[PDB]
Amino acid sequence: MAKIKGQVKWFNESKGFGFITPADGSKDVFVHFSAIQGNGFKTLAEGQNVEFEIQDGQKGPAAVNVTAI
Amino acid sequence: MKSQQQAKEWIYKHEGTGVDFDGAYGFQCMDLAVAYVYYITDGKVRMWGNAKDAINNDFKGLATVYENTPSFKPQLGDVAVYTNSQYGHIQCVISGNLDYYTCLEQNWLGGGFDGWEKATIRTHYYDGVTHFIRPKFSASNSNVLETSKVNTFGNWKQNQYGTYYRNENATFTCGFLPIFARVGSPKLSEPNGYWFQPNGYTPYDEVCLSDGLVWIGYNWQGTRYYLPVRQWNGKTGNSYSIGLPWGVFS
Ligand SMILES: [Ca+2]
């Protein structure tokens, strides 16, 4: 029941979304600002370690419970 | 365009429900306002952007933006926007006075993603709203959207796997959020594909009903792709209905 590790490929802090590249080397996963666990964050930086769950929705695979490092 | 009464019934019919046309996962604040404005404009206005961006959309003469001035009374059906936070917030006004107003809203508490927060009626003592978008309501009830050719089943072909499909020659431009295109078949169980980026577009030649979605079929770099484009209610015949679009068609 692990959580995937991955990298913030890029994040657009104006629009509130970006992409994470999982370590398992699968699809780029969509990350939305609402999926970052509160605590005064609401923005991620290019190329930083993150661990997260992956949810498969109608629009594609999305990052859940995104945590820094 | 729909009536103030229909907006009232829509607002209350959705009290306690999760409003998720998709876009962003879960029940976000902008999902509720987008669905609401789509409904009362009989499909003419699909707002793009975050909650704060809502005042930047093209309302096609169907609504006025007002600034929140200390004299301004929100009214039933108004859309309340908070512009001065990072991504903003947005609410469907139910009733207003100069001291406070009440509204239906999603993700006020931050539970929209996890799903424990649904569309809820709360009270606000002017705690950050900067604008109010007032619909130009019509005097009579309207069912234009419900009977529109887009919500009319019509004639569809069907393959042995239960996919309804039609030929259609048009262009689709992706809206504010990206969408993952599926290789070879309109199936959310197909894991291959690529992220169709916002504001990108493609010509397409086929439309499908599959997996609770409307899809476009198109060709790109030698590969056949299927892109989900809006929700389908799963029903055929006179019960058929599809949701607000995830991009713009032409
Ligand atoms: Ca949503």
- The tally of domains found in chain B comes to 2
Do B113 and A34 lie within an 8 Å CB cutoff? yes
User: Which of B232, B165, B159 is CA-nearest to residue B204?
Assistant: B165
Residues B191, B81 share a domain: no
* Domain harbouring B190, CATH code: 2.30.30.40
Do A60 and B213 lie within an 8 Å CB cutoff? no
End-to-end CA distance of chain B: 21
Residues B232, B185 share a domain: yes
Interface check for A64 against chain B (CB to CB < 8 A): the answer is yes
The SS3 call for residue A40 is coil
Question: Is B127 marked as binding a ligand?
Answer: no
Residues B137, B179 share a domain: no
Interrupted backbone of chain A, residues before each interruption (C–N > 2.5 Å): none
Residues B168, B117 share a domain: no
Residues B152, B118 share a domain: no
What is the distance in A from the centroid of ligand 1 to the CA of B244?
A: 12
Question: Is B33 marked as binding a ligand?
Answer: no
* Domain harbouring B92, CATH code: 3.90.1720.10
Residues B193, B114 share a domain: no
User: Which of B18, B244, B47 is CA-nearest to residue B151?
Assistant: B244
Residues B117, B51 share a domain: yes
Residues B64, B113 share a domain: yes
Task: Give the domain range for residue B65.
Answer: 4-141
The DSSP line for chain B is --BHHHHHHHHHHTTT-----SSSSS--HHHHHHHHHHHHTTTS----S-TGGGGGS--TTSEEEEE--TT----TT-EEEE-SSSS-EEEEEEEE-SS-EEEEESSSSS-TTTT---SEEEEESSSS--EEEEE--BSS---HHHHSGGG-----EE-TT--EEEEEEEEEEE-SS-EEEEESSS-TT---EEEE-TT-EEEEEEEEEETTEEEEEEEETTEEEEEEEEEB-S--GGG--B---SEEE-
Residues B110, B19 share a domain: yes
Comparing CB atoms, the residue among A19, A34, A60 nearest residue B26 is A34
B89 catalytic, yes or no?
yes
Comparing CB atoms, the residue among A26, A30, A38 nearest residue B110 is A38
Mutate to test the interface with B, among A52, A53, A59, A66 (most CBs of B within 10 A): A59
Domains of chain A, start order:
4-68 (2.40.50.140)
| Measured distance CA(B119)–CA(B139) in Å, rounded | 27
On chain B, the residues whose CB falls within 8 A of the CB of A38 are: 110
Q: Which of B14, B103, B105, B208 is catalytic?
A: B105
Interface check for A25 against chain B (CB to CB < 8 A): the answer is no
Residues B204, B125 share a domain: no
Residues B170, B129 share a domain: no
Q: Which of the listed residues B122, B141, B160 is the one where a domain comes to its end?
A: B141
Q: Which of the listed residues B96, B121, B141 is the one where a domain comes to its end?
A: B141
On chain B, the residues whose CB falls within 8 A of the CB of A19 are: 195
Q: Which of the listed residues B80, B111, B141 is the one where a domain comes to its end?
A: B141
- Give yes or no for a contact between A3 and A45, defined as CB atoms under 8 angstroms apart: no
Residues B89, B177 share a domain: no
